[PDB]
């Protein structure tokens, strides 16, 4: 078959119920995640191949980067709460992996300030129980699939994308195979 378990995707032994339709996990410390955002735009290209209604969810993980890694999961909850993911994703990636200017929680906050989030707005959100609950959701979702590596994408809590089983001589062909695979899995 053209799409095969073990090839473009794998099937979770214990599938998780009530999971978001398309769920990505990343870390701002994760080198392939940097590529998936800045060079490949995986999330955008997947979204372009799915129906207009479908929901895509993207969550940060704690297991890379120690204390700053957990700060970043909380900051990502702030981003989701305020709806400013698109404004902060690139400068967070570059601050962690390119310019080495993100070394503390205050440095993370600077990125939001420079992106135009008001200081009181960020601090209030950072300390809010709405954001605490979003942190819990990010952790629960990774726990549900015993997540030990990123980037990762899961479809309907049942299938895990396997990019290592796709072709990578051509970056654009790779992205469309990935997106087309997500489409095939969503229609399963």
- The residues binding ligand OMJ (CB under 6 A) are 32, 35, 39-40, 149, 151, 163-164, 168, 171, 174
Beta bridge partners of 56: 22
Closest separation in Å from C-beta 163 to ligand OMJ? 4
Query: In the complex with ligand OMJ, which residue's Cβ is closer, 29 or 122?
Result: 29
Query: In the complex with ligand OMJ, which residue's Cβ is closer, 36 or 112?
Result: 36
Closest separation in Å from C-beta 161 to ligand OMJ? 9
How many CA atoms, within 13 angstroms, populate the side-chain half-sphere of residue 157? 11
Closest separation in Å from C-beta 86 to ligand OMJ? 21
Q: How far is CA 176 from CA 6, 120, 185, in A?
A: 19, 41, 14
Alpha carbon 3 to chain centroid, angstroms: 24
Closest separation in Å from C-beta 61 to ligand OMJ? 11
Query: In the complex with ligand OMJ, which residue's Cβ is closer, 136 or 171?
Result: 171
Query: In the complex with ligand OMJ, which residue's Cβ is closer, 100 or 169?
Result: 169
Paired sense of beta strands 56-60 and 22-26, if any: parallel
- Separation between Cα atoms, residue 174 and residue 167, nearest integer Å: 6
Nearest position to ligand OMJ, beta carbon: 149
Closest CA to 104 of 138, 73, 67, 130: 67
Which ranges of the chain does DSSP label H, i.e. alpha helix? 31-38, 42-49, 66-82, 85-97, 105-114, 119-126, 129-144, 171-186
Closest separation in Å from C-beta 172 to ligand OMJ? 9
Query: In the complex with ligand OMJ, which residue's Cβ is closer, 25 or 122?
Result: 25
Greatest Cα-to-Cα distance within the chain, rounded to the nearest angstrom: 55
Query: In the complex with ligand OMJ, which residue's Cβ is closer, 63 or 184?
Result: 63
Closest separation in Å from C-beta 149 to ligand OMJ? 2
């Amino acid at each position: 078959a053209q799409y095969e378990d073990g090839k473009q995707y794998t099937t979770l032994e214990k599938p998780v119920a009530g999971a978001p339709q398309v769920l990505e996990f990343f870390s701002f410390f994760c080198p392939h995640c940097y590529q998936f955002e800045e060079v490949l735009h995986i999330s955008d290209n997947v979204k372009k191949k799915l129906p207009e209604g479908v929901k895509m969810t993207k969550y940060h993980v704690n297991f890379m980067g120690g204390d700053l890694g957990k700060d970043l999961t909380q900051a990502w909850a702030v981003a989701m709460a305020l709806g400013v993911e698109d404004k902060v994703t690139v400068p967070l990636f570059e601050g962690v992996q390119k310019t080495q200017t993100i070394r503390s929680a205050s440095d993370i906050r600077d990125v939001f300030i420079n992106a135009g989030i008001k200081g009181e707005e960020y601090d209030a959100a950072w300390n809010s129980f709405v954001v605490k609950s979003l942190v819990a959701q990010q952790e629960k979702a990774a726990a549900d699939v015993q997540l030990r590596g990123v980037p990762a994408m899961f479809v309907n809590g049942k299938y895990q994308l396997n990019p290592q089983g796709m072709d990578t001589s051509n970056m654009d062909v790779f992205v469309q195979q990935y997106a087309d695979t997500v489409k095939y899995l969503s229609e399963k």
